[PDB]
C-alpha cells in the first residue's frame, strides 16, 4: 500500500547509547524527520519518543 515517503522500518534492534539517541526494535515503524549531513544518522519519531537512529539499521518502507 502507499505509505509516507519518510516511514521506515527497523531492520535490527538498536539500544540508545543515551544522549538523545532513540532505542528501536526490529520491525518497528519509525517516521524520519531529519538527517545529519551524510544521512547516516536520522532524527526519528516512534511510539516511544524522538531521537537519533543510524541509517544502517533501518530502511524506508516504500518500494
Curated annotation (Swiss-Prot):
Ranges for domain SH3: 3-63
The protein's name: Tyrosine-protein kinase ABL1
PTM comment, free text: Phosphorylation at Tyr-12 by members of the SRC family of kinases disrupts SH3 domain-based autoinhibitory interactions and intermolecular associations, such as that with ABI1, and also enhances kinase activity. Polyubiquitinated. Polyubiquitination of ABL1 leads to degradation.
Gene giving rise to this polypeptide: ABL1
Tissue: Widely expressed.
Residues annotated with Phosphotyrosine modification: 12, 57
Record family assignment: Belongs to the protein kinase superfamily. Tyr protein kinase family. ABL subfamily.
Role noted for this protein: Non-receptor tyrosine-protein kinase that plays a role in many key processes linked to cell growth and survival such as cytoskeleton remodeling in response to extracellular stimuli, cell motility and adhesion, receptor endocytosis, autophagy, DNA damage response and apoptosis. Coordinates actin remodeling through tyrosine phosphorylation of proteins controlling cytoskeleton dynamics like WASF3 (involved in branch formation); ANXA1 (involved in membrane anchoring); DBN1, DBNL, CTTN, RAPH1 and ENAH (involved in signaling); or MAPT and PXN (microtubule-binding proteins).
Disease: Leukemia, chronic myeloid: A clonal myeloproliferative disorder of a pluripotent stem cell with a specific cytogenetic abnormality, the Philadelphia chromosome (Ph), involving myeloid, erythroid, megakaryocytic, B-lymphoid, and sometimes T-lymphoid cells, but not marrow fibroblasts. A chromosomal aberration involving ABL1 has been found in patients with chronic myeloid leukemia. Translocation t(9;22)(q34;q11) with BCR. The translocation produces a BCR-ABL found also in acute myeloid leukemia (AML) and acute lymphoblastic leukemia (ALL).
Assembly: Interacts with SORBS1 following insulin stimulation. Found in a trimolecular complex containing CDK5 and CABLES1. Interacts with CABLES1 and PSTPIP1. Interacts with ZDHHC16, ITGB1 and HCK. Interacts with STX17; probably phosphorylates STX17. Interacts with INPPL1/SHIP2. Interacts with ABI1, ABI2, BCR, CRK, FGR, FYN, HCK, LYN, PSMA7 RAD9A, RAD51, RAD52, TP73 and WASF3.
Location in or out of the cell: Cytoplasm, Cytoskeleton; Nucleus; Mitochondrion
Amino acid at each position: 500500500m502507499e505509505n509516507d515517503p519518510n516511514l521506515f522500518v527497523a531492520l535490527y534492534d538498536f539500544v540508545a547509547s543515551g544522549d538523545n539517541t532513540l532505542s528501536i526494535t526490529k520491525g518497528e515503524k519509525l517516521r524520519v524527520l531529519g538527517y545529519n549531513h551524510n544521512g547516516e544518522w536520522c532524527e526519528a519519531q516512534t511510539k516511544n519518543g524522538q531521537g537519533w537512529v543510524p541509517s544502517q539499521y533501518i530502511t524506508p518502507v516504500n518500494s
